[PDB]
Design a binder for this molecule. Sequence first.
Ligand SMILES: CC(C)C[C@H](N)C(=O)O
Length: 348
Amino acid sequence: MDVVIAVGAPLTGPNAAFGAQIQKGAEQAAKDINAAGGINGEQIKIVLGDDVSDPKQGISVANKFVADGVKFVVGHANSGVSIPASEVYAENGILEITPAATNPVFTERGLWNTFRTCGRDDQQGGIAGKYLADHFKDAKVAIIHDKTPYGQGLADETKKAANAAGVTEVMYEGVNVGDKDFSALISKMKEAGVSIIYWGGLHTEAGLIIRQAADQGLKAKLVSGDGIVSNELASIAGDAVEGTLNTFGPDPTLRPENKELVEKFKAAGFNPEAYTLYSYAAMQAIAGAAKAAGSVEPEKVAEALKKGSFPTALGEISFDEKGDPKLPGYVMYEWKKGPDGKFTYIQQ
Ligand SMILES: CC(C)C[C@H](N)C(=O)O
């Protein structure tokens, strides 16, 4: 009987681009695995659930998945969605592997079922905070976050690391997801002589801040994290995006092993940037662990994930006892025009 694997992701709403990364990556992996014989001889059946980046809607999705006999979830994207959804899954026999949720809490609750293919924000903030001190030691820095545990969590980790390395921010402020007029905040930053804005949050608000700062005459460079790795950042911000910095893990589209896979996505009309191959890899981890376990039972797959190593589009993957992957860490990217003439994130 088919192995039912769900993709839980923000298929609509502000983060739809990240939903597409996750959906397209998981769907292609399932197709490729199926063409190779499935998982232990059984075909994968994909079901989709749209969380709209809204924890309440994510919980409805999680319930739908339980009802539909889902055994594994690739998702969700947002930490505030994934953390509550994971409890529903943990209590109903479902293994959850997130390609993109980075808040430490996700794997720090002693749940049997939680895994990631991405890093976590104590790692990410350590890299970011050190970078601020190394390159902007004397700058006046504003730390701004989106009042979510992802965004504020990342901002707080970065703050801790920056402070320890000798950078004391001149502002620390929260804004609400969905708010779009940043004029007052931008004016406050300009008054304070801010030249670096560290942003703990997602691409929509980041793009709005970048665009508005340029228009309002605030000369400041925005530095953020994994939340801004989408072409849509450039679409909102316009050319003012140039020079923006952000942390992200390795860019898997640049791995030589993935050359043909990336070409295939493009032949299907999709640019498989950012988390696309992290989602592809999450599917591959499930398949590899089931093969090692001799079982598709989620609890047995979880045990196998914590024991072995498995081939993936991110490279060979293995997991610690909490479900975090043992993979390369965060690096700093800068936004510049790529070979195709579009602004994108390029490793420094
Ligand atoms: C899609 C990602 C930017 C999500 C973010 N890492 C979070 O944990 O909420």
